[PDB]
Structures are given as structure tokens and as C-alpha cells.
Design a protein around this ligand. Structure first.
Ligand code: MG
Ligand code: MG
Ligand code: MG
Ligand code: MG
Ligand code: MG
Length: 1052
């Protein structure tokens, strides 16, 4: 065996040592050192400049394009620069370049307190600064990056090993792999030989299938390598090092342990006979179960028992540990720090927690003490069994603080809490009860699992209803800000924000200036920040310490289902964790099995952040299991009726479907859906996208009718926000002063809208804007097939959601200056009509029925009670309460200032009219099964459109739904057919399509009189129907003695 060693060159001394008013920077050049050959470093140069952070440089060259700051000299080890300074304290900014290309991505900051001799060394592609070339040399010819992948028991994939005579896997249990003082790599190793990637590996890891493959001896003690650091090293045949890198091990962890580990159950499993704790930690060197008293004193520390087949650790004790607080004391190598870390971590399978999630807690969720009276018999108020059942789903996407934080008729101590839903006499609950009575069927809850980003210790939090003095007490940023003079005022924070409104504008956005500071220490966050996946959030409980929150959560679920009569959907956020690495307070999973539960860059091993935060890896078997097990608890123990997967596109199709198969065994009628856009993970696995989920019964949000009715798309900012009008805001037919939308473009949006009203099916046949016969898949959506679904239950239509601007704020952005306030209210209703009267599942943001505004805030996740306010006393819609946060919306300030004051802010009259409009629409959808056929083939047999093609009246949507003899059986004994007419236009429109029929305006709309969306509709003798501007009419063929002719779909 040849010894792997450093280059036969000697470890370098310093080329020059900085003198007075100088710094020296060495570049250790690996290429030039390995090459025998002399190097002309004339293309190497420094870009140097002073800023407020670093300012010690003397007369640095200003121009970026100036490459003439070439090396002062060079030797075999590389170039070096002698840099003139003005002082020897502080730090300098340095960008090391070749030509004008950065050799180090990090913009370096050489600190003269970190390195007091001001003589430093760096290596191309390495962000670290070294005190000597000797240190840099050992690093340049040491371990770098992490681009080797130990993907199964006997397979290593690694580009660094290609063509090299010696490829080895070096390992060290308690230290880092590194060369000794003789420059020899003296740790233990496994020898690897070249091989071809297997079919199994290429199937599992298609994004790695082009990597050079190397084979381990099929008898290696894998457990012994996996307990510490492993490093892949390649060398030349004389043993001289080629490269060394860290090893990503999730693959071999799954191949070695996953099946054995999948067969076990995890967490603190409490049951009569005792308790069994189990945690998966297949790389850990030691795991102890630490038991804590209620006052958080250690009362025991138990070495756990490792199971060799699975890599799980278990500990079995008596039932006296019920209610005990506990953590897992880990001894485990973390590849990010390259240290055998020592720390206590809460249970990833925690089912109860202490305040702020510091300790997990042993709980039996089956305990009757943790349930409201009657909980076990709680039934789902709305059926979800058939597709017809599912299609009735009409969702109200809500947030615990958005519901009750402002409602003075909710008891003060329940505002912002789960139990606010029990305050039957409150404005908010009475409003939801009427929404349910009129046909809202589901409450969807924004994150109510354990989020990280609200402090659950009440003393560390200040909300805007509390004294400004409390805010100063808990928030040193406020106390050091321009607002510090309010500290000893006697005003509440809300009182201050209110007085800041009058002088707030784009040139003085002081409301959001204060609110941005308030956001850091208030109770408010959407919560897409997972701390523990299977514990209720603590801050929404009146008592966040211990099991209390569990009963309060269930009391809320029971109130929504039993007393409000609505099903419950939970937002889940398995696509990322709040943090990873060995340090962060909220890194749980990545402390316990480092580098396994996060998705990592193939070259560097950095946790990726395509999401907001620390991307998870649901393609890994034990995280797929964690997800399914978590969903099982929410389903069984919390009686959740459905789940919305945040960013579902970062999950494999196979994993979401496996989860659904598992949960259907517990609740056969559970419904899964999520945001299924096309993602960038398709090189790693088939993603759970709109296209790939076709026919599976997993729903996805549709961006098709959304964009067509709202106008524009999620990538818009600046003038596009106003120019890109939608069907709901008058594309083509009521242009604003900025837009250039053509009539052809407006009719394309109507084609997408009709398609979406028919369920956005791939095979639905319609007549497009040009008179052409088109299947839904042939209607273009920004280059993609527009119709993608098999059944309308696979499509969730919407025109407003918690993310991006509210519908009202978009109408305010887009509406023509001459559209008055009453017209804009009808625009809101007409936009919602395309959703509520369509065949796809209907989804909507809490408060659209109240013209909800966020004061133009686009992304309000941390914009507090102020911008997310919903006023259930109906005094206004929260419009014009200050400029939104400048960091994200500042580039919109110009367009906001131009549009904001076009009309008055809605008041009680407009909000009451909007709620009437809204409940009219939901009542119509609820009233007949024809609106909610469920099955795509049935939609194709029954649903058609009029006013199509080249001669259409723009903006007039006319849909027919057949219940007559040609469709099959009568699904609705009262009618033979329905017509949905949405006149999204400022003209009256007359229809002759139904001349000679016995069409009648629906009784529901007639009863509303001049408060109806159909106010002023005329159904003449001859059967012609006229609709006023900005109106919606549902008309029907009354059913007689037998099923009649109906409205048969036209042959196309
Ligand atoms: Mg030095
Ligand atoms: Mg929390
Ligand atoms: Mg906040
Ligand atoms: Mg990638
Ligand atoms: Mg009928």
C-alpha cells in the first residue's frame, strides 16, 4: 500500500512580511504548485476599496475594470501583494481576481485584529483567511468541499477520483482526517476500485448518475466509518495527493438502516404498561435520554440502547414518566463543523413541549384529560368521500391572529388564541357562522403546528395593543431607534402607529418604519417556520407550558366542526426546516442525524434554500416516514380533515402518494393538496406537480384562472401591477391609463377563465377566442398546457391567498380611475364568482368577503397585526393604513401613490354589501350538485360555454351545465340545467342563446332584490336575458313531471 502524502515541495514560509503601513496577501496556487512549470501570474490582481465597514486601505484603485494591481512578486507557491495602508487597525476589503473574474466568491475582509501582523494567505475558491502560507498550504492540500457521495453500502460517487490510481475512503472516529506533521495521511482507510454506476443507484439518484463510480469491498464495517468523519482521498500512483473532500452519507444511511428503521415507531411512546422512547440516530456515538423536572432540573440521564439493524436508540421505563420533560443528549459528528458535537436536542417526534419548545414532554394524546367533552364522537360535518362530495369544498384560508387579534368582542384573554373560535357571541365567530350557513364549508388553518418565529415566553413579547413602554422593555432595536422618545410616553404602540398615519407617505413611510421593528418581538407570524412538526403551536394557547395547548387546540377543532359546521384543513410545511447545522436553537433534525434530513448541494454539502429556509429532503426514507407519521397524528389524534402541503413541488410525487396511501388507511376520506408548480428538483426525482399529479386525486392550486382573473402574475412589480389588468378588473373592456392589453389578450384571459370554471381539465373541449376547437391542454398558459387535470377535484381555483397582494389591493392597483367604489366592490364579487361558480374546488383568503386590504403589502408574513388586520366590526377593510414595508414593496411606492386615493376607502355599507354578494355566491354553489360534478368525464358530458369565438362580447362569461336527458340522470330534481352568466364589463349585455327556453332567474338571487349580484337582470318573454354591467346571474330551467331537454353540450 502506497502512503498518501502532501506534495514533495516543502511547506512554504512567508514570501514577505508586512512592514509599517502595509498589508500582505499571499495567493496559494494549487495548479502552479502541482505543475512543474513556471507561472506568469500577470492576470492575477486585487480589486480593493474602502467602505464604512473596512477603511484601512490607502488610495485604492477606483475602477473595477482596472486589472493592473498585479502581484508584487511570486514564487513556486503563488503570487503575493504588498498593499499600502493608512493605518494598522481595522480591516480591508479585498476581491481576489483573474482578469475581472472573482477567484473567491466571498468578498474578503482581512481583519487586522484577527491577524495582527497583517500578513495573510488565501486559496482560490476558499473563503477562509489564514495567518501564514504554511496554514494555507496544508488547507489547499487538505480536505475541501463535500462532493463525494457514499450512496449505498458499496458505492461511492465522486468526480475527484476520476482516472486516479489511488482512491480511498479515510476515516477518523474522534478527530478530523488530516495529514500528520510528516505530511502523510496516516488515518485508517478503505481502498476503492473504479466501477460503473448500478441501475439501482442511478434510479435512486438520477442527478448523480453521471458521477464517476467507485466500489468498496463488500465486507466493510460501514457502522464504524459512519460514526465519525469520513473523507474521500485520491492520489497519484507515487502516493502524492490529488484531492480530498468530505462525504455525503444520506444514501448509504438509507441503504444500511432505513428498512430496519422504518419498521419501528418513534418518540416518547406512553402506554399503560410504561413508556418506550425511540430516536433514529444512526451516526451518533452516544445518546442519553435526559429527564427533567417541571422546573427543568435534571432528575436522570439514561444511556440509551442502540439497535444495530436500524441505528435507532431506545429506552424503556415505567408509566411514572407521564408528563416528564426530556431531551436527547447527543454525541454526534456534524460534517458542517467537522466536530463530534455534544448537545441536548428536543424530540423530532415530540408530541408535547414546554414553553417555547425548549424541552419535549411525554404525553399520551389518547388521555381523556387532554380532550374536550364529546371529542371521540366528533364527526366531519361535510362529506369528502366521492368526487362530487369533494367538489363542494369551499375553503376559507384563515390565521389564528388574523381572526381575533382585533376583535374587541372576543374576550381579551382569547384574542389571538385557538379558543377565540369558542366565543360564540363575538363578531368574528358570528361572521364565520353565517359564512358557514351560506356555504363556506372548510376552514383552512395557516401554521398551527409548532412554529419557531414567535417567542412563547410572554414576557419577551410586546404587541401593539400594549404600552409603548413594554415594547421598549423587550426590544432594544426600538429603544435605540428614532421612535425611542415614545418609550416613556403613556401611549400604546397602536396609538403611536395611528398618529403616524396622517404624515405617512412614500417619502416618509414611518408607519412601516416603526412596524418593522415591532415585528421582531410581537406575537405575529404566518408560521411557515417549522420547529416541531407534530405539536400544536404554543403561543396560540392561553398556557404554553406543557400539555395545556393540546386540549385547547382540540377544543378549537371541535368548535369549528361541531358549532360552526365546517371541516378543517391544516397547512403543513414539510418542505423545509426553520434551521439546520449544529448551532441554531431551532435546528432539531439536523442536530440528531446531521446532513440527512436536509437537501444538500452536490458539490459543497451546504443545505439548500430554494425554499425560504433550510430545504428538507422528503426523498430520504426516514424523512418520508417522519412526514407520514406526523400526518397520522394530526389525522387520528386531532381529527384534521385535509392537508395543504406548502411548496408541495419540492416533494417527490411518490412520497406524497405514499403518504396519502398511509393516511387513507386511517381516514379514508382525507384530502391532500398543495402548491404544485414546476420546480427545479426534477433532476432529482419526479416532483409532485400539477402535471405529474394528473389523475392521482391529489389536488393542486391552479395558477391559470388565478392569473386570468386577477391579472398579471406573481413576478410582477412596478408598473406591471397596474398595466396587467385581469378579467375581474376590466382587461380590454375598461382599460386604465397605463395598460396596453389588446382585445386579443383579454380574450385569451377569458379562455383560461372559462377553462378554469370547467375544472381546468386537460381534455375539456372549448371554442377559443379565435373560434378554434381546443382541448384544455391546448390553451396556452405562458408556454405550458393550460388544462392539466383529470378531474375538477384535482384543481383548486382561487383569486386571493395569504401570499401576494389581496384581491382588493390588486383591484386598487388595476382598476381604471373612472371605476367608482361600488363598481370596484362588484369587481371583487365578479372575480370571486369565477371561483365560487366554477367546477374546481373553491379556495379563498379570509376576508375577501370584507374587501380585505393589507395596505398594498405584497408579502405580509411578518407585517404584524397592523397590516394583516381584519375588522369584524365592519368599519373599514384596512385599506390606506400606511405605506407597506419598504424592503419588499419600496419599488412599488410610486405606483401605489398614484393609484391609492382614486376612490374612498370601503366602510360599513360596502363591507355589508360585499358580504351579501359573497354569501349569495357561496349559497348558489351549495344549492345544486350541478356546480360540483366532481368527475371530469361528467364535466365533459354536461358543461359548455356560450359567447365564445371571434364574435364574442368581451368579458361576458356564459357557462351552461346540463341536467337534461342527454347528460344522463337528473342530479337535481328542481332543474333541468343551469346557466352561469358573469358580465365582467361596464356595458349591459343581452343574450339570445336561450331564446325560446323557459329560463328563469334563480330564486336565491331574486330574493336578494337590488342587493343581488343579479340586480336589474331581465329575463324577457321571448327568453332573451339582459345583464347590467358588472353582474352575475345564475339562471335555471325548472324541472317538470319528467326530466327535460336541458342544455346539451354542443358537438365540436
Ligand atoms: Mg501572518
Ligand atoms: Mg412555537
Ligand atoms: Mg413578528
Ligand atoms: Mg438541485
Ligand atoms: Mg334535474
Amino acid at each position: 500500500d502506497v502512503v498518501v502524502r502532501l506534495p514533495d515541495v516543502a511547506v512554504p514560509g512567508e514570501a514577505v512580511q508586512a512592514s509599517a503601513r502595509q498589508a500582505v496577501i499571499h495567493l496559494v496556487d494549487i495548479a502552479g504548485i502541482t505543475s512543474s512549470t513556471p507561472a506568469d501570474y500577470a492576470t492575477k490582481n486585487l480589486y480593493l476599496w474602502n467602505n464604512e465597514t473596512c477603511d484601512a486601505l490607502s488610495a485604492p484603485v477606483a475602477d473595477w475594470n482596472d486589472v493592473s494591481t498585479t502581484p508584487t512578486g511570486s514564487d513556486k507557491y503563488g503570487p503575493y501583494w504588498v498593499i499600502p495602508l493608512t493605518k494598522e487597525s481595522g480591516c480591508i476589503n479585498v476581491i481576489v481576481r483573474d482578469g475581472t473574474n472573482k477567484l473567491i466568491d466571498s468578498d474578503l475582509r482581512v481583519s487586522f485584529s484577527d491577524f495582527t501582523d497583517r500578513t495573510v494567505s488565501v486559496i482560490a475558491g476558499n473563503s477562509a483567511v489564514y495567518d501564514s502560507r504554511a496554514d494555507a498550504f496544508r488547507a489547499a492540500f487538505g480536505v475541501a468541499l463535500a462532493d463525494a457521495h457514499w450512496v449505498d453500502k458499496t458505492t461511492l460517487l465522486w468526480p475527484g477520483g476520476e482516472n486516479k490510481p489511488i482512491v480511498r475512503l479515510y476515516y477518523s472516529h474522534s478527530s478530523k482526517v488530516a495529514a500528520d506533521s510528516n505530511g502523510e495521511f496516516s488515518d485508517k482507510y478503505v481502498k476503492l476500485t473504479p466501477t460503473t454506476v448500478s441501475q439501482q443507484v442511478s434510479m435512486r439518484f438520477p442527478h448523480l448518475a453521471s458521477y464517476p463510480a467507485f466500489k468498496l469491498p463488500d465486507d466493510v464495517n460501514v457502522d464504524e466509518l459512519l460514526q465519525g468523519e469520513t473523507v474521500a482521498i485520491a492520489a497519484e500512483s507515487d502516493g502524492i495527493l490529488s484531492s480530498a473532500t468530505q462525504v455525503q452519507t444520506a444514501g448509504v444511511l438509507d441503504d444500511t438502516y432505513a428498512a430496519a428503521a422504518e419498521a419501528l415507531s418513534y418518540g416518547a411512546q406512553l402506554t399503560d404498561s410504561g413508556v418506550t422512547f425511540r430516536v433514529w440516530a444512526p451516526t451518533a456515538q452516544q445518546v442519553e435520554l435526559v429527564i427533567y423536572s417541571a422546573d427543568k432540573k435534571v432528575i436522570a440521564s439514561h444511556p440509551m440502547t442502540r439497535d444495530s439493524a436500524s441505528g435507532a436508540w431506545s429506552w424503556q421505563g415505567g408509566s411514572d414518566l407521564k408528563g416528564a420533560f426530556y431531551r436527547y443528549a447527543m454525541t454526534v459528528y456534524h460534517p458542517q463543523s467537522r466536530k463530534v458535537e455534544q448537545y441536548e436536542v428536543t424530540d423530532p417526534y415530540a408530541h408535547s413541549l414546554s414553553t417555547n419548545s425548549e424541552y419535549s414532554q411525554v404525553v399520551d394524546l389518547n388521555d381523556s384529560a387532554l380532550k374536550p367533552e364529546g371529542w371521540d364522537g366528533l364527526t366531519m360535518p361535510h362529506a369528502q368521500k366521492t368526487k362530487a362530495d369533494l367538489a363542494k369544498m369551499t375553503i376559507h384560508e384563515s390565521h389564528i391572529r388574523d381572526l381575533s387579534a382585533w376583535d374587541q368582542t372576543v374576550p381579551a384573554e382569547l384574542r389571538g388564541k385557538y379558543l377565540a373560535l369558542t366565543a360564540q357571541e363575538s363578531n368574528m365567530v358570528q361572521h364565520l357562522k353565517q359564512l358557514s350557513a351560506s356555504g363556506v364549508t372548510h376552514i383552512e388553518l395557516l401554521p398551527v403546528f409548532d412554529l419557531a418565529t414567535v417567542n412563547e415566553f410572554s414576557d419577551k413579547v410586546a404587541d401593539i395593543q400594549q404600552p409603548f413602554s413594554r415594547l421598549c422593555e423587550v426590544n432594544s432595536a426600538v429603544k435605540s431607534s428614532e421612535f425611542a422618545g415614545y418609550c416613556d410616553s403613556g401611549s400604546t404602540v397602536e396609538e403611536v402607529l395611528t398618529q403616524l398615519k396622517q404624515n405617512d407617505s412614500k417619502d416618509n413611510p414611518q408607519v412601516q418604519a416603526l412596524n418593522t421593528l415591532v415585528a421582531q418581538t410581537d406575537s405575529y407570524n404566518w408560521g411557515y417556520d417549522p420547529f416541531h412538526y407534530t405539536v400544536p403551536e404554543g403561543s396560540y394557547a392561553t398556557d404554553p407550558e406543557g400539555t395545556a395547548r393540546i386540549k385547547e387546540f382540540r377544543t378549537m377543532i371541535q368548535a369549528i366542526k361541531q358549532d360552526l359546521g365546517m371541516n378543517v384543513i391544516m397547512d403543513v410545511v414539510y418542505n423545509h426546516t426553520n434551521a439546520a447545522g449544529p448551532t441554531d436553537r431551532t435546528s432539531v433534525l439536523d442536530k440528531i442525524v446531521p446532513w440527512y434530513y436536509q437537501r444538500l448541494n452536490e458539490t459543497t454539502g451546504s443545505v439548500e434554500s430554494a425554499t425560504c429556509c433550510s430545504d428538507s429532503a422528503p426523498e430520504h426514507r426516514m424523512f418520508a416516514k417522519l412526514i407520514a407519521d406526523s400526518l397520522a397524528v394530526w389525522t387520528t389524534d386531532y381529527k384534521i380533515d385535509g392537508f395543504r402541503f406548502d411548496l408541495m413541488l419540492y416533494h417527490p410525487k411518490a412520497q406524497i402518494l405514499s403518504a396519502w396511501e398511509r393516511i387513507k388507511a386511517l381516514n379514508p376520506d382525507i384530502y391532500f393538496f398543495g402548491e404544485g408548480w414546476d420546480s427545479n428538483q426534477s433532476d432529482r426525482f419526479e416532483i409532485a406537480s400539477q402535471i405529474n399529479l394528473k389523475g392521482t386525486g391529489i389536488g393542486t392550486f391552479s395558477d391559470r384562472l388565478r392569473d386570468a382573473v386577477r391579472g398579471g402574475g406573481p413576478f410582477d412589480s412596478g408598473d406591471a401591477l397596474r398595466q396587467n389588468q385581469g378579467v375581474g378588473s376590466g382587461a380590454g373592456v375598461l382599460p386604465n391609463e397605463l395598460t396596453t392589453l389588446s382585445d386579443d389578450q383579454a380574450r385569451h384571459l377569458a379562455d383560461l377563465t372559462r377553462l378554469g370554471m370547467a375544472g381546468n381539465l386537460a381534455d375539456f373541449v372549448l371554442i377559443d377566442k379565435d373560434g378554434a376547437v381546443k382541448r384544455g391542454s391546448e390553451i396556452d398558459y405562458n408556454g405550458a398546457p393550460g388544462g392539466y387535470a383529470a378531474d375538477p377535484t384535482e384543481v383548486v381555483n382561487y383569486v386571493s391567498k395569504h401570499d401576494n397582494q389581496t384581491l382588493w389591493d390588486m383591484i386598487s392597483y388595476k382598476a381604471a380611475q373612472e371605476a367608482d367604489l361600488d363598481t370596484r366592490v362588484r369587481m371583487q364579487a365578479v372575480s370571486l364568482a369565477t371561483v365560487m361558480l366554477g367546477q374546481g374546488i373553491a379556495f379563498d383568503q379570509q376576508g375577501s368577503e370584507l374587501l380585505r386590504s393589507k395596505s398594498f403589502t405584497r408579502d405580509s408574513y411578518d407585517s404584524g397585526d397592523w397590516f394583516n388586520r381584519v375588522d369584524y366590526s365592519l368599519q373599514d377593510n384596512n385599506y390606506n393604513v400606511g405605506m407597506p414595508r419598504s424592503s419588499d414593496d419600496g419599488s412599488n411606492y410610486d405606483i401605489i401613490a398614484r393609484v391609492k386615493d382614486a376612490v374612498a376607502t370601503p366602510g360599513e355599507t360596502e363591507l355589508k354589501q360585499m358580504t351579501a354578494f359573497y354569501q349569495e355566491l357561496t349559497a348558489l354553489r351549495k344549492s345544486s350538485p350541478l356546480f360540483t360534478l366532481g368527475d371530469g368525464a361528467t364535466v365533459m358530458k354536461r358543461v359548455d360555454f356560450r359567447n365564445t369565438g371571434a364574435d364574442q362580447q368581451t368579458g361576458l362569461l356564459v357557462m351552461t351545465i346540463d341536467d337534461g336527458m342527454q347528460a344522463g340522470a337528473s342530479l337535481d330534481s328542481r332543474v333541468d340545467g343551469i346557466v352561469v352568466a358573469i358580465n365582467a364589463a361596464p356595458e349591459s349585455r343581452t343574450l339570445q342563446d336561450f331564446a325560446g327556453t323557459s329560463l328563469q332567474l334563480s330564486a336565491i338571487q331574486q330574493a336578494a332584490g337590488d342587493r343581488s349580484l343579479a340586480s336589474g337582470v331581465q329575463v324577457a318573454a321571448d327568453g332573451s336575458v339582459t345583464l347590467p354591467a358588472w353582474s352575475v346571474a345564475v339562471l335555471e330551467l325548472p324541472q317538470g313531471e319528467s326530466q327535460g331537454a336541458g342544455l346539451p353540450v354542443s358537438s365540436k
